[PDB]
């Protein structure tokens, strides 16, 4: 009767970013780059914890990683690549019937908009996260298919119209809508000032020697591929009471803040996917949300 979902339905991710390496340059001398190295320092502080005042007179010594621009370079340079891949509907472990009728129900999905918002998050430098705070200007250089595009200061929380973002979203939507691949080589330049703190990815480790460990590749500050990924796929402006774009998540999850904007309101990925497969009609943006979840990849479990 009802076409139910497999026990596990799995898709691979289709936006594949690399690690972001962090160099230091001068804004008007971008061909003399030097790597930003992770260092270690002592940090003494107080016990300023909301709970207990009875131990605020004691201190706490700590040691942490830190990363800074040198005192003779004013510009942070962040480098990475992003590979977009097609065949966004070939399941990796899910069955045949459910996945194929879903591929059929979603072939009319607005891929131009998804490609635009991906490329736009890349070009405006949302992937730079806290490295955006306090920048004089941000300049993004994207090299794709022997073409070089330059982007100056761009509004991140609005997907404002730009002819070059659209010109790259052309090829990106062409690959996503069909098959093949396309690789963008991305550079970011931020004018922060000589000696400014940069913000590499923070490590999630049980390490008693450090209170804060920054991600490093042979000592050089870097950012996790998965964090750049979480930045790029932040395109969801379609949940109820929508304010700012959030990352494509099956439950609209922002565990960061302790809320999920798609929990228990008929608008989660599984409700909408069961709808799409079982004959129901989908909004253009519900189609976009479900297909963006497929682009995200995942191992969606539960069912029979």
């Amino acid at each position: 009767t009802k076409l139910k979902a497999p026990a596990v339905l799995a898709y691979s991710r289709k936006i594949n970013p690399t690690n972001a390496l962090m160099f230091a340059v001068n804004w008007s001398d971008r061909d003399n780059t030097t790597a930003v190295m992770v260092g270690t320092k002592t940090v003494a502080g107080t016990q300023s914890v909301r709970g207990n005042p009875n131990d605020a007179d004691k201190g706490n010594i700590q040691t942490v990683n830190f990363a800074n621009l040198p005192h003779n370079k004013n510009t942070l340079l962040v480098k990475y690549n992003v590979k977009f891949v097609g065949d966004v509907f070939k399941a990796e472990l899910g069955g045949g019937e459910y996945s194929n009728t879903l591929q059929t129900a979603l072939e009319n999905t607005d891929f131009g908009t998804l490609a635009y918002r991906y490329v736009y998050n890349i070009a405006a430098g949302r992937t730079l996260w806290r490295n955006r705070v306090g920048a004089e200007s941000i300049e993004t250089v994207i090299t794709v298919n022997d073409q070089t595009f330059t982007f100056s200061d761009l509004l991140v929380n609005e997907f404002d119209e730009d002819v070059d973002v659209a010109e790259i979203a052309d090829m990106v939507a062409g690959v996503l809508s069909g098959e093949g691949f396309v690789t963008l080589k991305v550079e970011h330049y931020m004018l922060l000032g000589e000696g400014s703190e940069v913000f590499p990815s923070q490590e999630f480790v049980e390490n008693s020697k450090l209170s804060k460990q920054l991600f490093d590749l042979n000592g050089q500050a870097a950012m996790h591929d998965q964090k750049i990924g979480n930045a790029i796929r932040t395109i969801d402006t379609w949940y109820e009471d929508a304010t700012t774009p959030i990352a494509v998540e099956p439950y609209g999850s922002v565990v960061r803040n302790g809320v999920a904007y798609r929990a228990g309101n008929k608008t989660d990925l599984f409700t909408l996917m069961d709808g799409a497969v079982n004959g129901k009609s989908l909004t253009e943006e519900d189609q976009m949300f479900v297909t963006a979840n497929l682009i995200r990849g995942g191992v969606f479990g539960g069912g029979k």
Binding site: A7, V8, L93, N218, V299, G301
Partner: protein, 177 residues
Amino acid sequence: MIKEMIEDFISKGGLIFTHSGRYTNTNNSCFIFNKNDIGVDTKVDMYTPKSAGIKNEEGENLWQVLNKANMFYRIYSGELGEELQYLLKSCCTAKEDVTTLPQIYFKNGEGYDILVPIGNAHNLISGTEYLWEHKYYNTFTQKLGGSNPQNCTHACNKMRGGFKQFNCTPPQVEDNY
């Protein structure tokens, strides 16, 4: 006490195994008791809900008793009578479960078998203790079944310090060449 501990274990979920997918994922509950592995020193893992079970006068539960003094072999091989042998053998039942587990193809005589890997309890209980004894330090420490270990496995529940994994980092070509 010993028969009483075995019976108390049987009353609860009572599973005895030498391989499991629960080391890979706390919500797997796929257990396998490879008979051909049982030797005089083979360490064994057990599952019971919340890792509950009576403690003997020295404060040990069944998992701690069976993995001392080759007790599990002496019972499994009939050296302590057929009542205990039956009771212990009855728990060594398999539980198939493939969800969440990895699946690889592997070339078998110009064909392919699908392999679903699960971890071996002996190599972690025994080999952790062994690398500890022989002062082997080239290792990562990995605690299994986080925060609530006793909901996972008796070995995880009573070895909360973690299991030792071989640090398989390769040598690196130096920068200067």
